[PDB]
Amino acid sequence: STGSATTTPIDSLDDAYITPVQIGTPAQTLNLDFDTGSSDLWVFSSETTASEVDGQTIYTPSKSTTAKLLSGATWSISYGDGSSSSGDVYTDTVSVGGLTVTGQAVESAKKVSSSFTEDSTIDGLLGLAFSTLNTVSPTQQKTFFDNAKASLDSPVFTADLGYHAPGTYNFGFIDTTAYTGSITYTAVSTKQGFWEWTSTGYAVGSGTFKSTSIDGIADTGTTLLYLPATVVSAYWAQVSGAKSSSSVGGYVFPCSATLPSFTFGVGSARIVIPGDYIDFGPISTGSSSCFGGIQSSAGIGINIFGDVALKAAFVVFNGATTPTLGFASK
Ligand SMILES: NN[C@@H](c1nnnn1CCc1ccccc1)C1CCCCC1
């Protein structure tokens, strides 16, 4: 089997991407944030504290004839950005772009933190990291990809995120028309539960490539590109007037600037992030100070190849017995 679904930016800045997901019988379609940095599929629901719902579409398990409460199961997640959610668990039928999994753990939110409430466009998350990170207790549950794997034509999914435009998540096949050149594959460590790999270096604009190992994760659920402070300093030093602002929380730059590209290495191959992809607009409405899309990972504890980097490439998440990651230009 295969599946193919369009993913759409939630706003004009590509702050996140939402993908429609059918849950239950009859289908209830929710727009979920596909997150290769976490491993819980959770949804706003009829059980979510009413004051914490503000425009989201909710899953109502009592209206699904295939929903079954998973007895005694609870979940609770504290995300790296300080957000959180928790609740109970149903199993139900979940379909993504024509691909159907029966008996998928659907984690129903009873509580969500303010940042989720305040984003009316995201109805929940669909985790695509490794199932070892799933938070369901006392019986850990599998991700949608792990459940579908055996049925897929090939045990892979691909992320093709658009710049200020829709893109595609495919399951079970590689669309050879969706990229240019060849896909370069690179080794993955699952030791932290992430799609963790090692970039071979970087370049800033037209500058020379610096060969240096950068360990990080491929994370569709992170907006920006978080890299070591040395790398980030070298990038913003090429932007006149750019500075790191403690009050804003990262590098900012004059909105009048033309940003240089950023290149990262995948083995001997190179992925080029155009400068425009690094512009996340005014720090506040009407400001002429703009927020940078490349930020320091210092104090995160890990480098993150988030959407800024991933949307410059066609990315293969290969879930073979030994997982790997593939990157192609497009
Ligand atoms: N999508 N899973 C990330 C996440 N969890 N919560 N937010 N992010 C977005 C990333 C981020 C990093 C720093 C500041 C703000 C946001 C995890 C972050 C911590 C490492 C594991 C992945």
Side-chain angles (χ1 to χ4, degrees), residues 1-62 64-67 69-110 112-141 143-148 150-190 192-242 244-330:
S1 65
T2 63
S4 180
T6 297
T7 194
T8 303
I10 64 166
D11 58 28
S12 63
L13 298 175
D14 297 350
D15 281 315
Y17 300 76
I18 47 172
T19 309
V21 179
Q22 283 68 50
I23 309 174
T25 310
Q28 304 180 34
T29 300
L30 273 65
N31 296 329
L32 304 186
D33 186 350
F34 282 25
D35 179 14
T36 61
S38 69
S39 303
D40 287 50
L41 194 176
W42 74 261
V43 296
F44 280 78
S45 71
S46 57
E47 304 176 331
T48 309
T49 299
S51 70
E52 293 173 353
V53 184
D54 185 7
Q56 294 79 12
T57 295
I58 60 172
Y59 170 59
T60 303
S62 67
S64 170
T65 59
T66 43
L69 182 71
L70 188 60
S71 180
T74 60
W75 63 279
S76 181
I77 187 151
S78 309
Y79 291 104
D81 66 351
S83 69
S84 62
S85 52
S86 63
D88 52 21
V89 188
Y90 295 79
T91 57
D92 209 341
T93 304
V94 172
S95 298
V96 175
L99 170 66
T100 300
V101 170
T102 58
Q104 172 67 45
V106 176
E107 300 171 36
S108 169
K110 288 174 155 228
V112 304
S113 67
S114 58
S115 63
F116 290 115
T117 301
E118 295 166 357
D119 187 356
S120 67
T121 72
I122 292 169
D123 302 324
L125 269 61
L126 188 150
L128 295 166
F130 292 88
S131 294
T132 52
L133 297 175
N134 177 265
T135 75
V136 174
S137 179
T139 305
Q140 191 173 60
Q141 300 294 306
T143 67
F144 174 83
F145 179 53
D146 263 7
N147 281 325
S151 303
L152 297 176
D153 290 359
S154 182
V156 307
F157 68 91
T158 65
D160 181 8
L161 302 180
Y163 167 66
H164 297 175
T168 304
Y169 280 103
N170 291 331
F171 292 83
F173 72 105
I174 290 163
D175 181 355
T176 61
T177 75
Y179 57 87
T180 65
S182 59
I183 303 174
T184 296
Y185 289 87
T186 200
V188 165
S189 171
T190 65
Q192 301 187 73
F194 303 119
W195 294 91
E196 187 173 357
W197 64 291
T198 299
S199 173
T200 47
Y202 70 98
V204 176
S206 57
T208 56
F209 186 84
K210 173 74 164 177
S211 292
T212 185
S213 296
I214 305 171
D215 180 286
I217 65 174
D219 185 3
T220 59
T222 293
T223 311
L224 304 187
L225 171 53
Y226 294 88
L227 293 172
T230 53
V231 179
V232 178
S233 184
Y235 178 80
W236 289 109
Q238 296 306 308
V239 181
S240 187
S244 182
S245 167
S246 44
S247 59
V248 178
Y251 279 87
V252 296
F253 68 95
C255 293
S256 62
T258 302
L259 298 177
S261 62
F262 185 88
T263 300
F264 64 94
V266 185
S268 53
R270 306 286 179 254
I271 301 290
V272 179
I273 306 169
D276 287 349
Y277 289 25
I278 300 165
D279 181 355
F280 279 75
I283 60 175
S284 292
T285 308
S287 181
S288 75
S289 187
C290 274
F291 196 68
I294 295 177
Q295 300 291 348
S296 177
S297 64
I300 295 172
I302 199 163
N303 301 302
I304 306 172
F305 294 88
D307 297 335
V308 161
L310 301 185
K311 76 175 81 173
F314 176 91
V315 187
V316 180
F317 294 80
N318 171 27
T321 298
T322 298
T324 65
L325 272 172
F327 291 83
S329 295
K330 65 191 187 186

